[PDB]
């Protein structure tokens, strides 16, 4: 029925990265939707949208997320995930950072990313849309095939969760004891994201290379009740997953390895797709050849130092455009 959207976002050169040449190794064409990489010998790859080095946070949100957020409110499950080498901007893009000195409020911090922006807009868009709705969110991170709850307000972070097949959902799982915090309004948001960021920091003291190796699944489930002209009970449920994947360069890497075998299985149209053999592919089975509306943001470097992963990343992301999903709304 419908193709997975792939986008590419390149970041500006960082402090480590030397640029020798007068003209770029990575050129992004937003109009032609082409990323062109100098291996005058090139490989040019077309994507669904492309975002060069100076693309700001608000544009990414505007171009990619605003459209998807509308599908969430109709009650499609969506899933945006970020993919690419450590240091290209998967966390910058999906979470963002906090500007120093309290120069800006969270709502207006231009370093803010998809997660906080989205949560903010869910409340603006639904408050003046007439709907009866609630928002409850959760923050699960996978590391070494273990499940960490960063929003559980009480528990020690190293208390890890179990997963089991949802007896109500053919291609889904329930994460037992996962803290699903109800957000009653936008002013409850920051406090929740802070607690998430803090617990995360604690988990990093416990495990090696945690930032780069962890997958981070930040869900948000919109319950929307609506009365019909016929006097019925229209209860629709949007779910948006916002997934920050472990760095592409990596049992520690079982989930990332399996994500590859799944995508491979799907594109080459081989009958057995091994969702079941990793926690990530179990949690997101429905985002990959299922009934969810997936977008991948593939984050690349502009620089010669990281060309090899920049290109690995582009080939991996580009074959992912051939996956067909059959979106369905939850009532």
Ligand X SMILES: Nc1ncnc2c1ncn2[C@@H]1O[C@H](COP(=O)(O)OP(=O)(O)O)[C@@H](O)[C@H]1O
Of 57, 91, 295, 301, the residue at the interface with ligand 4C5 (CB under 6 A) is 91
Map residue 169 onto helix, strand or coil.
Answer: coil
CB contact burial 82-91 (16+ within 10 A = b; e otherwise): bbbbbbbbbb
Q: Which of residues 99-138 bind ligand 4C5 (CB under 6 A)?
A: 106, 109, 112, 115-116
Binding site partner of 110, from ligand 4C5, ligand X, Mg ion, none, Cβ cut-off 5-8 A by kind: none
CA–CA distance, 63 with 158 (Å, rounded to integer): 38
By the rule CB under 6 A, 306 interacts with ligand X: no
Quote the least distance from Cβ 29 to ligand X, whole Å.
17
Q: Which is nearer to ligand X, 1 or 16 (CB)?
A: 16
Binding site partner of 11, from ligand 4C5, ligand X, Mg ion, none, Cβ cut-off 5-8 A by kind: ligand X
By the rule CB under 6 A, 90 interacts with ligand X: yes
Q: Which two tokens stand for residue 80?
A: 């945006």
Quote the least distance from Cβ 90 to Mg ion, whole Å.
5
Of 87, 116, 172, 290, the residue at the interface with ligand X (CB under 6 A) is 87
Binding site partner of 218, from ligand X, ligand 4C5, Mg ion, none, Cβ cut-off 5-8 A by kind: ligand 4C5
Helices (H) and strands (E) in the chain, counts: 9, 16
**What are the distances in angstroms from CA 26 to CA 8, 43, 306?**
12, 10, 11
Instruction: Reduce the secondary structure of 306-317 to three states and give it as a string.
Output: HHHHHHHHHHHH
By the rule CB under 5 A, 91 interacts with Mg ion: yes
By the rule CB under 6 A, 299 interacts with ligand X: yes
- Count of residues that bind ligand 4C5 according to CB under 6 A: 16
Length of the chain: 331
By the rule CB under 5 A, 248 interacts with Mg ion: no
CA–CA distance, 297 with 243 (Å, rounded to integer): 10
By the rule CB under 6 A, 97 interacts with ligand X: yes
- Counting other chains too, the contacts that 176-179 makes at CB distance below 8 Å and 24 or more residues apart are 177/149, 177/152, 178/138, 178/140, 178/149, 179/138, 179/149, 179/151, 179/152, 179/153
CA–CA distance, 234 with 331 (Å, rounded to integer): 7
Instruction: Please choose, out of 31-39, 82-90, 202-210, 306-314, the segment that lies near ligand X by the rule CB under 6 A.
Output: 82-90
Query: Residues 192, 181: contact at Cβ < 8 Å?
Result: yes
Q: Which of residues 163-222 bind ligand 4C5 (CB under 6 A)?
A: 193-194, 196-197, 218
Instruction: Please choose, out of 26-34, 71-79, 94-102, 128-136, the segment that lies near ligand 4C5 by the rule CB under 6 A.
Output: 94-102
Q: Is 247 labeled as ligand-binding?
A: no
Query: Residues 69, 117: contact at Cβ < 8 Å?
Result: no
Instruction: Please choose, out of 1-9, 90-98, 278-286, 316-324, the segment that lies near Mg ion by the rule CB under 5 A.
Output: 90-98
Q: Which is nearer to ligand X, 138 or 299 (CB)?
A: 299
What angle, 0 to 180 degrees and rounded to 10, lies between the N-to-C axes of helices 254-267 and 307-319? Answer: 50
By the rule CB under 6 A, 310 interacts with ligand X: no
Placement of tokens 């002013």 in the chain? 187
- Extract the annotated binding site for ATP: 84-91
Residue ranges binding ligand X (CB under 6 A)? 11-12, 14, 86-92, 97, 247, 299
Residue ranges binding ligand 4C5 (CB under 6 A)? 91, 95-98, 106, 109, 112, 115-116, 139, 193-194, 196-197, 218
């Amino acid at each position: 029925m419908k193709n997975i959207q792939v986008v590419v976002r390149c970041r500006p050169f960082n402090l480590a990265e030397r640029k020798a040449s007068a003209h770029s190794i990575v050129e992004c064409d937003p109009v032609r939707k082409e990323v062109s990489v100098r291996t005058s010998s090139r490989k040019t790859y077309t994507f669904d949208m492309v975002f060069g080095a100076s693309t700001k946070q608000i544009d990414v949100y505007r171009s990619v997320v605003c459209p998807i957020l509308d599908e969430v409110i109709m009650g499609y499950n969506c899933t945006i995930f970020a993919y690419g080498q450590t240091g290209t901007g998967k966390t910058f893009t999906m979470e963002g950072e906090r500007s120093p000195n309290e120069e800006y409020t969270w709502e207006e911090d231009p370093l803010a990313g998809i997660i906080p922006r989205t949560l903010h807009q869910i409340f603006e868009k639904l408050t003046d849309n007439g709907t009866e709705f609630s928002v409850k969110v959760s923050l699960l991170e996978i590391y070494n095939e273990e499940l960490f709850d960063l929003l559980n307000p009480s528990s020690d972070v190293s208390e890890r969760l179990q997963m089991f097949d949802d007896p109500r959902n053919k291609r889904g799982v329930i994460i037992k004891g996962l803290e699903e915090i109800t957000v009653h309004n936008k002013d409850e948001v920051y406090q929740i994201l802070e607690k998430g960021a803090a617990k995360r920091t604690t988990a990093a003291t416990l495990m090696n290379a945690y930032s780069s190796r962890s997958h981070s699944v930040f869900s948000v489930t919109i319950h929307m009740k609506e009365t019909t002209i016929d006097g019925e009970e229209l209860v629709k449920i949007g779910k948006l997953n916002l997934v920050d994947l472990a760095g592409s360069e990596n049992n520690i890497n079982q989930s990332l390895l399996t994500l590859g075998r799944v995508i491979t299985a799907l594109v080459e149209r081989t009958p057995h797709v091994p969702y079941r053999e990793s926690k990530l592919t179990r949690i997101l089975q429905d985002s990959l050849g299922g009934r969810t509306r997936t977008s991948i943001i593939a984050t690349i470097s502009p620089a010669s130092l990281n060309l090899e992963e920049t290109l690995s990343t582009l080939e991996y992301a580009h074959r992912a455009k051939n996956i067909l999903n059959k979106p369905e709304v939850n009532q």
